[PDB]
Amino acid sequence: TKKFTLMEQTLPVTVYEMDFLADLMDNSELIRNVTLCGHLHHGKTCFVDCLIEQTHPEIRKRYDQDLCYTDILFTEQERGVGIKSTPVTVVLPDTKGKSYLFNIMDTPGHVNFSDEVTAGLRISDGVVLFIDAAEGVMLNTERLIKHAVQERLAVTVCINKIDRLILELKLPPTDAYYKLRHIVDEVNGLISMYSTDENLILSPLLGNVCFSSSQYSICFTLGSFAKIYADTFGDINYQEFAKRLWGDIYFNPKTRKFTKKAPTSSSQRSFVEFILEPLYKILAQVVGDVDTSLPRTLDELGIHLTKEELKLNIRPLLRLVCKKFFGEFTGFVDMCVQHIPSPKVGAKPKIEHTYTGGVDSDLGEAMSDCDPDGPLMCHTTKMYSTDDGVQFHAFGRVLSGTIHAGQPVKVLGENYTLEDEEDSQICTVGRLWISVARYHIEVNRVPAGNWVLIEGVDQPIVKTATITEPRGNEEAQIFRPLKFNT
Amino acid sequence: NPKPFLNGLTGKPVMVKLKWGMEYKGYLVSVDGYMNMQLANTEEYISGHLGEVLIRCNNVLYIRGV
Amino acid sequence: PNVVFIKTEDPDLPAFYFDPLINPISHRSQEPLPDDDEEFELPEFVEPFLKDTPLYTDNTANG
Amino acid sequence: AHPPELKMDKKLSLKLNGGRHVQGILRGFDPFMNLVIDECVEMAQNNIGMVVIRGNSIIMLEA
Amino acid sequence: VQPINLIFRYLQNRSRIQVWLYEQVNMRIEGCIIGFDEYMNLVLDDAEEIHSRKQLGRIMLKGDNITLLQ
Amino acid sequence: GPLSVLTQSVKNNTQVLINCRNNKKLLGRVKAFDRHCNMVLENVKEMWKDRYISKMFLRGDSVIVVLR
Amino acid sequence: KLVRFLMKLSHETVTIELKNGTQVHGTITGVDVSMNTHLKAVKMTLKNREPVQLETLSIGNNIRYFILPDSLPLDTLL
Amino acid sequence: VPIKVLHEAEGHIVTCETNTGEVYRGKLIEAEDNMNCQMSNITVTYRDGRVAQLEQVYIRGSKIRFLI
Amino acid sequence: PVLDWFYDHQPLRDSRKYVNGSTYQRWQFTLPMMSTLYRLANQLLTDLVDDNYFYLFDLKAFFTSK
Amino acid sequence: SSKMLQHIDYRMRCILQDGRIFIGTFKAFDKHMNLILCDCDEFKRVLGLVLLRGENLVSMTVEG
Numbered sequence A: 001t002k003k004f005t006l007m008e009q010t011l012p013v014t015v016y017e018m019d020f021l022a023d024l025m026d027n028s029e030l031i032r033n034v035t036l037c038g039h040l041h042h043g044k045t046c047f048v049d050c051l052i053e054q055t056h057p058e059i060r061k062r063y064d065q066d067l068c069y070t071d072i073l074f075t076e077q078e079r080g081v082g083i084k085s086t087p088v089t090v091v092l093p094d095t096k097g098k099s100y101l102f103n104i105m106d107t108p109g110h111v112n113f114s115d116e117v118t119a120g121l122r123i124s125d126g127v128v129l130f131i132d133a134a135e136g137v138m139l140n141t142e143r144l145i146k147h148a149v150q151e152r153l154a155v156t157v158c159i160n161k162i163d164r165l166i167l168e169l170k171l172p173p174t175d176a177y178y179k180l181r182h183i184v185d186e187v188n189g190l191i192s193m194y195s196t197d198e199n200l201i202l203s204p205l206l207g208n209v210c211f212s213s214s215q216y217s218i219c220f221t222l223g224s225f226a227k228i229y230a231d232t233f234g235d236i237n238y239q240e241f242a243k244r245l246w247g248d249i250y251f252n253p254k255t256r257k258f259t260k261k262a263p264t265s266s267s268q269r270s271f272v273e274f275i276l277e278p279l280y281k282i283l284a285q286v287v288g289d290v291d292t293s294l295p296r297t298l299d300e301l302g303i304h305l306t307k308e309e310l311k312l313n314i315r316p317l318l319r320l321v322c323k324k325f326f327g328e329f330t331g332f333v334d335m336c337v338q339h340i341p342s343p344k345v346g347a348k349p350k351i352e353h354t355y356t357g358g359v360d361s362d363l364g365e366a367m368s369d370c371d372p373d374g375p376l377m378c379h380t381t382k383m384y385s386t387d388d389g390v391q392f393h394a395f396g397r398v399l400s401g402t403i404h405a406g407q408p409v410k411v412l413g414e415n416y417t418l419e420d421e422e423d424s425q426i427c428t429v430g431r432l433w434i435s436v437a438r439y440h441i442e443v444n445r446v447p448a449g450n451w452v453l454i455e456g457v458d459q460p461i462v463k464t465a466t467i468t469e470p471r472g473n474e475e476a477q478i479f480r481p482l483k484f485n486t
Numbered sequence B: 001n002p003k004p005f006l007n008g009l010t011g012k013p014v015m016v017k018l019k020w021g022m023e024y025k026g027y028l029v030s031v032d033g034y035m036n037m038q039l040a041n042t043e044e045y046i047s048g049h050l051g052e053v054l055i056r057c058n059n060v061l062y063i064r065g066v
Numbered sequence C: 001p002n003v004v005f006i007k008t009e010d011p012d013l014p015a016f017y018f019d020p021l022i023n024p025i026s027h028r029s030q031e032p033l034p035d036d037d038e039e040f041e042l043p044e045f046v047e048p049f050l051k052d053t054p055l056y057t058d059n060t061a062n063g
Numbered sequence D: 001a002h003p004p005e006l007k008m009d010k011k012l013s014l015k016l017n018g019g020r021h022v023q024g025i026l027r028g029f030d031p032f033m034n035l036v037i038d039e040c041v042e043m044a045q046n047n048i049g050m051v052v053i054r055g056n057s058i059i060m061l062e063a
Numbered sequence E: 001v002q003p004i005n006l007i008f009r010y011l012q013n014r015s016r017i018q019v020w021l022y023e024q025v026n027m028r029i030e031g032c033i034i035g036f037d038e039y040m041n042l043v044l045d046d047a048e049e050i051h052s053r054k055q056l057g058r059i060m061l062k063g064d065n066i067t068l069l070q
Numbered sequence F: 001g002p003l004s005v006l007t008q009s010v011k012n013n014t015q016v017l018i019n020c021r022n023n024k025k026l027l028g029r030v031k032a033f034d035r036h037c038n039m040v041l042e043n044v045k046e047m048w049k050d051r052y053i054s055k056m057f058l059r060g061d062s063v064i065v066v067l068r
Numbered sequence G: 001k002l003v004r005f006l007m008k009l010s011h012e013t014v015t016i017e018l019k020n021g022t023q024v025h026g027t028i029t030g031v032d033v034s035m036n037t038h039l040k041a042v043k044m045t046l047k048n049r050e051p052v053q054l055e056t057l058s059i060g061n062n063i064r065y066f067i068l069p070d071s072l073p074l075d076t077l078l
Numbered sequence H: 001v002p003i004k005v006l007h008e009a010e011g012h013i014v015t016c017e018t019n020t021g022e023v024y025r026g027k028l029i030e031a032e033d034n035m036n037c038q039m040s041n042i043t044v045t046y047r048d049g050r051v052a053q054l055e056q057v058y059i060r061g062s063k064i065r066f067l068i
Numbered sequence I: 001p002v003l004d005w006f007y008d009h010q011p012l013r014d015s016r017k018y019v020n021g022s023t024y025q026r027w028q029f030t031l032p033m034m035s036t037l038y039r040l041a042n043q044l045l046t047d048l049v050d051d052n053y054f055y056l057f058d059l060k061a062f063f064t065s066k
Numbered sequence J: 001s002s003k004m005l006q007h008i009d010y011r012m013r014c015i016l017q018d019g020r021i022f023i024g025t026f027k028a029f030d031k032h033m034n035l036i037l038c039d040c041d042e043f044k045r046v047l048g049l050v051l052l053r054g055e056n057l058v059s060m061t062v063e064g
């Protein structure tokens, strides 16, 4: 046998039922098509592992090793690097508990593997960039910022590996705030000099910068952490506290108000005093006072833990403490819902940038409507192999229509045009596979705004292809090929 | 406070007349702190014998304790 | 990813201290700020979580 | 939950819900804005001396 | 004199005060009052409620379910 | 609390008849209640004619009485 | 509980029947903590009268009944 | 700033709509938390158009719905 | 912390808060005595912090080389 | 209580407890949905700047 699968033949619980996800995938309004990208080894795979630990109840990371859920080829496990990009469709709740479908395209951070990132750009509608806090912005992150400017997608930034400033660098809170503010300033300057549009300027106050540590399951925005303070004391407003945290906003404890100037000497900001210093004291109580004042700190946070959890080693105990402190991941859900549009919302510039026929053609507005009815025309760019490697399966978003398994589909190549009908090839779809990383879901009806693997169309496709109805066909043009960064 | 009166009326027989003429006589099993009552083997009219029933917080105009 | 770990010599230095062996940031356009003390003054009994807790111990850097 | 905004202690007419109105000398308010009225003759003159009129159903009070 | 103090005095004296419902004069409850709670909940003691005066004994009325008790 | 949990269990196992304060007598499965009696009922026929509602949410001010 | 389920299913199409008899059936724009919530394309049928198609109607707790759609499993809010 | 808009109308006679349906034109001297404002020379129509005048009217906010 | 029992054949076998008992199977300890022992064992211990020092000097590279 | 920012400029029509429905430009509102709506015309009269309370406003919609 060929052991190149990493396949889960069983289906896990994933907390919720399958039919709630099946009802959520009919929307294409609460569905967010987002590519995770960044530099090499920035905890993006461990971040998707943290989302799998949130959603899948029985799937947990081991203490000794960091698992890699998206990396499913054996070559990725051998080399110890992400190689092939992976899509995951999941139901995610925000701080308000509203369920949103997430079509996530986790990509490797390698510029020689940036072709997969360009394919994930062509499928997805939003981009989340991972930044290591100790390292900052490097060459592949710069080139992906340039390609995101060219691809015209909504980009939000999560800053990963924030524990390297703390445990590994031992920075003062003022200097750590200075480094993070300089990181935000250089990202905003790079957006200014690549992007000609300056309405998007990324700030933690504006809901653009999330903070994360994917080896300890830390993910919060200012709104999420002010929601944590609101759940502690509900007298505050978490929206105004997220407005008043970042950016030289100094707390005045005599008036209990907020100024733009420090009221006394060595007065720190609301961001520093309410986020950086208590998290530093939390980690100091972990790594210095694990037996003396750790249950005192646990009761101060309102968390109850058993004795064997306190007898654990420091890193999985700290991961469990941060998981119980921040709950599940909700700031990222608000990040990709409130600041990254739906296929229905942001359909227009992607189909403008991709379709050679444009959005001005009637099939163009049928594309931009994100219609579950109407034409069944799609674009499959990434076209994976299988576990045995004998047969192949396509993968793509559905720009409009509903794919059915057994419903016939004509596939058209890149060289297809209105006089070249030779690239047209008709096959019915064998099965429709909603792609999670280590398992796939057999579904029947796939509407617009949805990512799905296609079985049985693997013959005429070379790299990318367009997907149309074989009968009742109209003037269907060909989407633009994947122009690579390299 | 009516908390000890509700604790006494819990598991005890009484009648309750509502604003809409709903008079229900029977054994109230449990009444909450906001006077959300629950009854067993009661006969109501406004109807017949309902048996196990419940009420809202203040839907009854007057509770005649038997 | 390369381990760049600061190693301390004395416990006189704090556990959150700028090492001069680290190259300085030299950080160099405004911020979207709300009204300063015109709205949303904080209520009574709101506080950071570990404001009573001290910053660091001598065994903190040991850990 | 508060007292009435008239302190009251005068010959005044209080109208309840449904327009039922009495007139008499007020004595004092309550936490539910309930007024005790002395010689509360119903101006629609039934008075029983000590009339405990509830502010939950009381709608208006004019001198 | 506060109305809560007047209701407590009427409950202590158990006077046969004519009491109506919350803006509803269909039942005029005249009779002794056993006691009053802190949330103005009234307990009657064989108060005849004329519609058909039928005194029953211990009857509990809510704090805002009575409008005029004189 | 416990009585509301027992009423929700009886509504899940049988057909509970809740007569709300909007004259809505609904026989069916009351899915959940609340501390403010925000009641959600799943697949209940309500008479205002017992028209079936697949999921009905009602407030505690608009509810009056329940029965198993 | 029920407010959290309404906030979760506050994008689908539901009917809100008020205490005044106004039945606004349409897509939910947003559900607040209170009963004052904004709806989208609601055909508010009046009491024994016709409907009015309002693209933005904000509700007080006058909205009594809420006929919810089938976009809510048994363990979706449990 | 609705409280400021209500406070800017103090010392003048304005018309208000009642919960029953009446229209009352009057001038207030002070206001309360539950809209139980003390008003002088208030003429209330009693939902029939017959304006009757009263003084020192501490009419509660359950009676008065809005402005008219 | 290591001042008493550092030279015993069974150092902390008596202590129930550290070991399971007389079988001497599993140890559960405190941070300052690992700090003291980590300071004391500096001669035998290495100073490397990552496997990136072992670039092609690793076991997979040696298996490839053979 | 949170619908004031959506109708802080556009006109809205709300029905009070009297049954009168007034359409006007909501300029300000209170925390208990007591919305001061300037230039309110009730269906026919004019109420001016009318502060319609949250309990009074049983039904409302966006007119302008």
Ligand SMILES: Nc1nc2c(ncn2[C@@H]2O[C@H](COP(=O)(O)OP(=O)(O)OP(=O)(O)O)[C@@H](O)[C@H]2O)c(=O)[nH]1
Binding pocket: A038, A039, A040, A041, A042, A043, A044, A045, A046, A047, A066, A068, A081, A082, A083, A107, A108, A109, A110, A160, A161, A162, A163, A164, A212, A213, A214, A215, A216, C001
């Ligand atoms: N110090 C530190 N390391 C982390 C953190 N989060 C993740 N890592 C480590 O970073 C390593 C590499 O990141 P991956 O999880 O493989 O994600 P990735 O960025 O997609 O990796 P590539 O595909 O190579 O780009 C993981 O094995 C983790 O051990 C963190 O918060 N702090």
Ligand SMILES: [Mg+2]
Binding pocket: A041, A044, A045, A046, A081, A082, A108, A109
């Ligand atoms: Mg990776």
